[PDB]
Amino acid sequence: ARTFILWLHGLGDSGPANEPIQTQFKSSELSNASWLFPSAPFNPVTCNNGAVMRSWFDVPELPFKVGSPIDESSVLEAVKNVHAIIDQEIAEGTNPENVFICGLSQGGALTLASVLLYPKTLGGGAVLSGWVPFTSSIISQFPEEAKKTPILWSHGTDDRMVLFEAGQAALPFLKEAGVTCEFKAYPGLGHSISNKELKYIESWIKRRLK
């Protein structure tokens, strides 16, 4: 069956820069999968004093701590673009439970928002070193089926760009929302992707495909 993996890059990065990630998923189950690595528009970014770069949504403050300010309206605009991608792939014949959304840092925050607001259950959302980009006021708007999408959250314990504490803060948020989240901490890892972290995501996607 057709598998679709949408990967969302982090702040200032691009889709093509991250496309080689797919070569790290060498299993026969995942080499069949269709990948998409979109690029965020060029936007001013508040944490960089308005400097323009590829950015999914405005980031008021980086490093991101528990309690850091967020721009909820801007995240919700970015979710619309992600949802258009997902809608198209499903309409073209892909089973929603074969759709996986992954992302790093800003892209992980967007992954979380996009999955939890999508009207259908998806295969899963993999957050790498992200943060929760809205407050608990949004939970009432999570569609019924979205709460059944599993989340795998990966975070380095030594991350000082998006504090590990901010990644841990997603867990009581997801529990309040009724969402199942596996949290995988990576000791000594900072704000980057490790191969062992990607290998675990692959195993998790394979298990979800069942």
Side-chain angles (χ1 to χ4, degrees):
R2 180 176 176 92
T3 301
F4 178 75
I5 303 177
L6 182 64
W7 185 281
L8 307 174
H9 66 78
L11 178 61
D13 206 356
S14 68
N18 284 279
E19 285 175 338
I21 283 173
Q22 71 192 274
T23 72
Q24 296 309 300
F25 294 68
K26 300 184 177 300
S27 74
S28 210
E29 297 83 341
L30 269 305
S31 303
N32 155 90
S34 323
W35 296 72
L36 208 238
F37 290 79
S39 290
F42 285 98
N43 292 293
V45 184
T46 292
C47 65
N48 278 180
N49 294 327
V52 171
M53 68 205 70
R54 287 201 189 278
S55 175
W56 293 110
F57 58 82
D58 196 16
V59 176
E61 180 172 277
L62 218 50
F64 192 93
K65 333 158 221 164
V66 170
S68 278
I70 56 187
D71 187 335
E72 188 160 326
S73 290
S74 182
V75 153
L76 290 178
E77 283 285 355
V79 168
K80 289 168 57 171
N81 172 238
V82 172
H83 283 189
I85 296 170
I86 303 165
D87 291 339
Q88 183 75 108
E89 181 64 21
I90 288 166
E92 285 170 1
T94 304
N95 192 260
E97 307 221 70
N98 296 338
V99 172
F100 298 83
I101 321 302
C102 316
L104 174 70
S105 190
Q106 186 190 47
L110 219 207
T111 286
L112 215 238
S114 294
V115 165
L116 296 177
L117 287 162
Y118 199 68
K120 300 175 182 180
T121 309
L122 300 173
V127 175
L128 293 82
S129 308
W131 61 92
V132 4
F134 30 62
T135 67
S136 58
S137 302
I138 198 68
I139 290 182
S140 60
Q141 308 313 121
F142 291 170
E144 179 181 348
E145 282 194 39
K147 300 176 170 184
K148 308 178 194 200
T149 303
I151 303 295
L152 172 66
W153 193 296
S154 303
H155 217 117
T157 70
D158 281 16
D159 196 335
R160 287 179 86 78
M161 286 288 284
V162 179
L163 276 52
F164 184 72
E165 198 180 42
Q168 288 179 300
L171 299 184
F173 179 97
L174 263 4
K175 194 108 48 190
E176 184 176 345
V179 174
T180 294
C181 181
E182 175 184 358
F183 191 91
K184 196 101 218 164
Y186 285 90
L189 182 64
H191 201 67
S192 62
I193 299 174
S194 72
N195 182 71
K196 71 196 269 181
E197 173 186 28
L198 281 185
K199 286 203 41 56
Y200 190 76
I201 292 162
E202 182 177 38
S203 292
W204 174 82
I205 291 179
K206 284 200 306 183
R207 280 195 298 279
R208 171 59 161 155
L209 293 172
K210 287 157 154 313

Short mmCIF file of all heavy atoms in Angstrom, two decimals, residues 46-47 57-72 75 109 130-136 155 159-167 169-170 173:
data_model
loop_
_atom_site.label_atom_id
_atom_site.label_comp_id
_atom_site.label_asym_id
_atom_site.label_seq_id
_atom_site.Cartn_x
_atom_site.Cartn_y
_atom_site.Cartn_z
N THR A 46 10.58 37.26 13.94
CA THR A 46 10.72 38.19 15.06
C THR A 46 11.95 37.88 15.90
O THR A 46 12.66 38.80 16.32
CB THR A 46 9.45 38.15 15.91
OG1 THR A 46 8.36 38.71 15.16
CG2 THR A 46 9.65 38.93 17.20
N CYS A 47 12.24 36.60 16.14
CA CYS A 47 13.40 36.28 16.97
C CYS A 47 14.71 36.67 16.30
O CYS A 47 15.73 36.78 16.99
CB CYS A 47 13.40 34.80 17.34
SG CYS A 47 13.62 33.66 15.95
N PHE A 57 6.21 29.79 10.36
CA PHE A 57 5.35 30.68 11.12
C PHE A 57 6.26 31.53 11.99
O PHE A 57 7.40 31.16 12.25
CB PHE A 57 4.32 29.91 11.96
CG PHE A 57 4.94 28.94 12.92
CD1 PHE A 57 5.43 29.38 14.14
CD2 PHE A 57 5.04 27.59 12.61
CE1 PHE A 57 6.00 28.49 15.03
CE2 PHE A 57 5.61 26.69 13.50
CZ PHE A 57 6.09 27.14 14.71
N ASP A 58 5.73 32.65 12.47
CA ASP A 58 6.61 33.57 13.18
C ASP A 58 6.99 32.98 14.54
O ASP A 58 6.17 32.37 15.23
CB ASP A 58 5.97 34.94 13.36
CG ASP A 58 7.01 36.01 13.74
OD1 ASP A 58 8.22 35.76 13.56
OD2 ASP A 58 6.60 37.08 14.22
N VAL A 59 8.25 33.18 14.89
CA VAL A 59 8.83 32.69 16.13
C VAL A 59 9.28 33.90 16.94
O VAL A 59 10.29 34.53 16.63
CB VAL A 59 10.01 31.73 15.86
CG1 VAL A 59 10.69 31.30 17.16
CG2 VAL A 59 9.52 30.51 15.10
N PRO A 60 8.51 34.28 17.96
CA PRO A 60 8.87 35.47 18.75
C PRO A 60 10.19 35.33 19.48
O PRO A 60 10.90 36.33 19.64
CB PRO A 60 7.70 35.62 19.73
CG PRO A 60 6.57 34.85 19.12
CD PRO A 60 7.19 33.74 18.33
N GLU A 61 10.55 34.13 19.91
CA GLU A 61 11.67 33.98 20.83
C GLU A 61 12.36 32.65 20.61
O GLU A 61 11.71 31.60 20.59
CB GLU A 61 11.18 34.10 22.28
CG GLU A 61 12.26 33.95 23.33
CD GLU A 61 11.73 34.27 24.71
OE1 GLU A 61 11.68 35.47 25.06
OE2 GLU A 61 11.38 33.32 25.44
N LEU A 62 13.69 32.71 20.46
CA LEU A 62 14.55 31.55 20.34
C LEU A 62 15.83 31.94 21.08
O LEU A 62 16.33 33.06 20.88
CB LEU A 62 14.85 31.21 18.88
CG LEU A 62 14.94 29.77 18.44
CD1 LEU A 62 13.75 28.96 18.90
CD2 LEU A 62 15.04 29.75 16.91
N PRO A 63 16.39 31.07 21.94
CA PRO A 63 15.94 29.73 22.33
C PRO A 63 14.54 29.71 22.92
O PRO A 63 14.06 30.69 23.49
CB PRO A 63 16.97 29.32 23.39
CG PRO A 63 18.21 30.06 23.00
CD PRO A 63 17.71 31.39 22.51
N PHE A 64 13.88 28.57 22.75
CA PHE A 64 12.52 28.38 23.22
C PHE A 64 12.54 27.68 24.57
O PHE A 64 13.03 26.54 24.67
CB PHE A 64 11.72 27.57 22.21
CG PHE A 64 10.25 27.59 22.49
CD1 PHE A 64 9.44 28.53 21.88
CD2 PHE A 64 9.69 26.70 23.40
CE1 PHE A 64 8.07 28.58 22.15
CE2 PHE A 64 8.33 26.74 23.67
CZ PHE A 64 7.53 27.67 23.05
N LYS A 65 11.99 28.34 25.58
CA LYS A 65 11.89 27.84 26.94
C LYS A 65 10.43 27.57 27.26
O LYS A 65 9.52 28.05 26.57
CB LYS A 65 12.44 28.86 27.94
CG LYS A 65 13.50 29.78 27.39
CD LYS A 65 13.61 31.06 28.23
CE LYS A 65 13.79 32.30 27.36
NZ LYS A 65 13.52 33.57 28.09
N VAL A 66 10.20 26.83 28.35
CA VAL A 66 8.86 26.76 28.90
C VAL A 66 8.40 28.18 29.23
O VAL A 66 9.10 28.92 29.93
CB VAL A 66 8.82 25.86 30.14
CG1 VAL A 66 7.48 25.99 30.85
CG2 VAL A 66 9.08 24.42 29.75
N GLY A 67 7.26 28.57 28.69
CA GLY A 67 6.76 29.91 28.86
C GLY A 67 7.18 30.90 27.80
O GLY A 67 6.79 32.07 27.89
N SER A 68 7.96 30.48 26.81
CA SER A 68 8.35 31.40 25.76
C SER A 68 7.11 31.86 24.99
O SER A 68 6.15 31.09 24.84
CB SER A 68 9.34 30.76 24.79
OG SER A 68 10.66 30.80 25.30
N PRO A 69 7.10 33.09 24.50
CA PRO A 69 5.95 33.56 23.72
C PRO A 69 5.85 32.81 22.40
O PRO A 69 6.85 32.38 21.83
CB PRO A 69 6.26 35.05 23.49
CG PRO A 69 7.76 35.13 23.59
CD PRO A 69 8.13 34.13 24.64
N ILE A 70 4.61 32.68 21.92
CA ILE A 70 4.29 32.02 20.67
C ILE A 70 3.32 32.91 19.89
O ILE A 70 2.61 33.74 20.46
CB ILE A 70 3.67 30.62 20.88
CG1 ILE A 70 2.44 30.74 21.78
CG2 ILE A 70 4.70 29.66 21.47
CD1 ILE A 70 1.85 29.42 22.19
N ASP A 71 3.31 32.73 18.57
CA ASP A 71 2.39 33.43 17.67
C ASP A 71 1.38 32.40 17.14
O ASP A 71 1.57 31.81 16.08
CB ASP A 71 3.15 34.12 16.54
CG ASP A 71 2.25 35.00 15.68
OD1 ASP A 71 1.02 34.77 15.61
OD2 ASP A 71 2.79 35.94 15.05
N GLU A 72 0.28 32.24 17.87
CA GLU A 72 -0.69 31.19 17.56
C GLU A 72 -1.37 31.42 16.22
O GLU A 72 -1.58 30.48 15.45
CB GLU A 72 -1.71 31.09 18.69
CG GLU A 72 -2.65 29.93 18.58
CD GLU A 72 -3.31 29.60 19.91
OE1 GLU A 72 -2.65 29.77 20.96
OE2 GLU A 72 -4.49 29.17 19.89
N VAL A 75 0.93 30.23 13.34
CA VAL A 75 0.97 28.77 13.26
C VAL A 75 -0.25 28.25 12.52
O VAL A 75 -0.19 27.34 11.69
CB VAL A 75 1.05 28.18 14.68
CG1 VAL A 75 0.45 26.78 14.75
CG2 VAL A 75 2.45 28.22 15.22
N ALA A 109 7.16 21.61 15.58
CA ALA A 109 6.01 22.33 16.11
C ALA A 109 4.87 22.35 15.10
O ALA A 109 3.71 22.14 15.46
CB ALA A 109 6.42 23.77 16.49
N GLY A 130 10.81 19.66 18.75
CA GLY A 130 9.85 20.71 18.54
C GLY A 130 9.36 21.33 19.83
O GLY A 130 9.98 21.20 20.90
N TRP A 131 8.24 22.03 19.74
CA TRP A 131 7.60 22.63 20.90
C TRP A 131 6.12 22.72 20.59
O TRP A 131 5.71 22.56 19.44
CB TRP A 131 8.19 24.00 21.23
CG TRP A 131 8.05 25.08 20.14
CD1 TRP A 131 7.04 25.99 20.01
CD2 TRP A 131 8.99 25.38 19.09
NE1 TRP A 131 7.27 26.82 18.94
CE2 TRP A 131 8.47 26.48 18.37
CE3 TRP A 131 10.21 24.83 18.69
CZ2 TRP A 131 9.12 27.03 17.26
CZ3 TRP A 131 10.87 25.39 17.60
CH2 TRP A 131 10.33 26.49 16.90
N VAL A 132 5.29 22.97 21.60
CA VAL A 132 3.86 23.10 21.38
C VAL A 132 3.58 24.55 21.01
O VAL A 132 3.96 25.46 21.78
CB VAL A 132 3.01 22.60 22.56
CG1 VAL A 132 3.87 22.18 23.73
CG2 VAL A 132 1.86 23.52 22.92
N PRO A 133 3.05 24.83 19.80
CA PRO A 133 3.02 26.20 19.28
C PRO A 133 1.70 26.92 19.49
O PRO A 133 1.45 27.94 18.83
CB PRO A 133 3.30 25.99 17.79
CG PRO A 133 2.59 24.70 17.51
CD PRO A 133 2.75 23.84 18.74
N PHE A 134 0.85 26.39 20.37
CA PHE A 134 -0.40 27.05 20.75
C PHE A 134 -0.67 26.76 22.22
O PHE A 134 0.00 25.95 22.85
CB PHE A 134 -1.60 26.62 19.89
CG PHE A 134 -1.52 25.20 19.36
CD1 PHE A 134 -1.49 24.12 20.23
CD2 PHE A 134 -1.67 24.96 18.00
CE1 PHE A 134 -1.46 22.82 19.74
CE2 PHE A 134 -1.68 23.66 17.51
CZ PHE A 134 -1.58 22.59 18.38
N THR A 135 -1.68 27.45 22.78
CA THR A 135 -2.05 27.21 24.17
C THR A 135 -3.17 26.18 24.25
O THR A 135 -3.71 25.73 23.24
CB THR A 135 -2.48 28.50 24.86
OG1 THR A 135 -3.71 28.97 24.29
CG2 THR A 135 -1.42 29.57 24.70
N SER A 136 -3.54 25.82 25.49
CA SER A 136 -4.56 24.80 25.71
C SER A 136 -5.93 25.23 25.19
O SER A 136 -6.81 24.37 25.03
CB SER A 136 -4.65 24.46 27.20
OG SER A 136 -4.95 25.61 27.98
N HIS A 155 13.50 14.09 21.51
CA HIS A 155 14.11 15.32 22.00
C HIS A 155 15.42 15.00 22.70
O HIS A 155 15.51 14.04 23.48
CB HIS A 155 13.17 16.07 22.96
CG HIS A 155 13.24 17.56 22.84
ND1 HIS A 155 12.16 18.32 22.44
CD2 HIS A 155 14.24 18.43 23.10
CE1 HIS A 155 12.51 19.60 22.42
NE2 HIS A 155 13.76 19.69 22.84
N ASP A 159 19.51 19.77 24.75
CA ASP A 159 19.07 20.81 23.83
C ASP A 159 18.89 22.12 24.58
O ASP A 159 18.09 22.21 25.51
CB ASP A 159 17.76 20.38 23.19
CG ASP A 159 17.40 21.19 21.95
OD1 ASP A 159 17.84 22.36 21.80
OD2 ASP A 159 16.64 20.64 21.13
N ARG A 160 19.64 23.15 24.17
CA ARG A 160 19.48 24.49 24.70
C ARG A 160 18.92 25.46 23.67
O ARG A 160 18.83 26.67 23.96
CB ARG A 160 20.82 25.02 25.25
CG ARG A 160 21.23 24.35 26.55
CD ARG A 160 22.58 24.86 27.06
NE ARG A 160 22.48 26.06 27.88
CZ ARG A 160 22.09 26.08 29.15
NH1 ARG A 160 21.76 24.95 29.77
NH2 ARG A 160 22.04 27.23 29.82
N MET A 161 18.56 24.97 22.48
CA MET A 161 17.87 25.77 21.48
C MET A 161 16.37 25.71 21.69
O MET A 161 15.68 26.74 21.72
CB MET A 161 18.21 25.27 20.07
CG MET A 161 19.61 25.63 19.61
SD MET A 161 19.73 27.39 19.26
CE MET A 161 18.88 27.43 17.68
N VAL A 162 15.85 24.50 21.84
CA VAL A 162 14.50 24.26 22.32
C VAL A 162 14.67 23.39 23.55
O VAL A 162 15.00 22.20 23.43
CB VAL A 162 13.62 23.59 21.25
CG1 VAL A 162 12.23 23.34 21.83
CG2 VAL A 162 13.55 24.50 20.04
N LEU A 163 14.50 23.99 24.73
CA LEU A 163 14.89 23.30 25.95
C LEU A 163 14.15 21.98 26.07
O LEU A 163 12.97 21.86 25.72
CB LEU A 163 14.61 24.18 27.18
CG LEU A 163 15.70 25.20 27.52
CD1 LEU A 163 16.12 26.08 26.33
CD2 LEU A 163 15.27 26.09 28.67
N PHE A 164 14.88 20.95 26.54
CA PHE A 164 14.27 19.65 26.80
C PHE A 164 13.00 19.80 27.64
O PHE A 164 12.00 19.14 27.39
CB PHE A 164 15.29 18.75 27.50
CG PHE A 164 14.82 17.35 27.74
CD1 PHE A 164 14.68 16.45 26.70
CD2 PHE A 164 14.54 16.91 29.03
CE1 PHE A 164 14.26 15.16 26.92
CE2 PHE A 164 14.12 15.62 29.26
CZ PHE A 164 13.98 14.73 28.21
N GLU A 165 13.04 20.71 28.63
CA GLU A 165 11.88 21.00 29.47
C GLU A 165 10.67 21.42 28.64
O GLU A 165 9.53 21.09 28.98
CB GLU A 165 12.26 22.11 30.46
CG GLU A 165 11.37 22.27 31.66
CD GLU A 165 11.86 23.39 32.57
OE1 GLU A 165 12.25 24.45 32.04
OE2 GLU A 165 11.87 23.21 33.81
N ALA A 166 10.89 22.17 27.55
CA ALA A 166 9.78 22.55 26.68
C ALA A 166 9.24 21.36 25.91
O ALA A 166 8.02 21.28 25.65
CB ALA A 166 10.22 23.65 25.72
N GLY A 167 10.10 20.41 25.53
CA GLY A 167 9.60 19.19 24.92
C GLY A 167 8.82 18.34 25.90
O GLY A 167 7.79 17.75 25.55
N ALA A 169 7.10 19.46 28.29
CA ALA A 169 5.83 20.14 28.52
C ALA A 169 4.74 19.72 27.55
O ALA A 169 3.56 19.93 27.83
CB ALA A 169 6.04 21.66 28.45
N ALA A 170 5.11 19.13 26.41
CA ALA A 170 4.10 18.64 25.48
C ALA A 170 3.30 17.49 26.08
O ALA A 170 2.14 17.29 25.72
CB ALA A 170 4.75 18.19 24.17
N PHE A 173 0.22 18.50 28.01
CA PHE A 173 -0.67 19.09 27.02
C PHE A 173 -1.36 18.01 26.20
O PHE A 173 -2.58 18.04 26.01
CB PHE A 173 0.14 20.04 26.13
CG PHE A 173 -0.66 20.71 25.04
CD1 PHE A 173 -1.16 21.99 25.21
CD2 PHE A 173 -0.89 20.06 23.83
CE1 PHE A 173 -1.90 22.61 24.20
CE2 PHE A 173 -1.63 20.67 22.82
CZ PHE A 173 -2.12 21.95 23.01
#
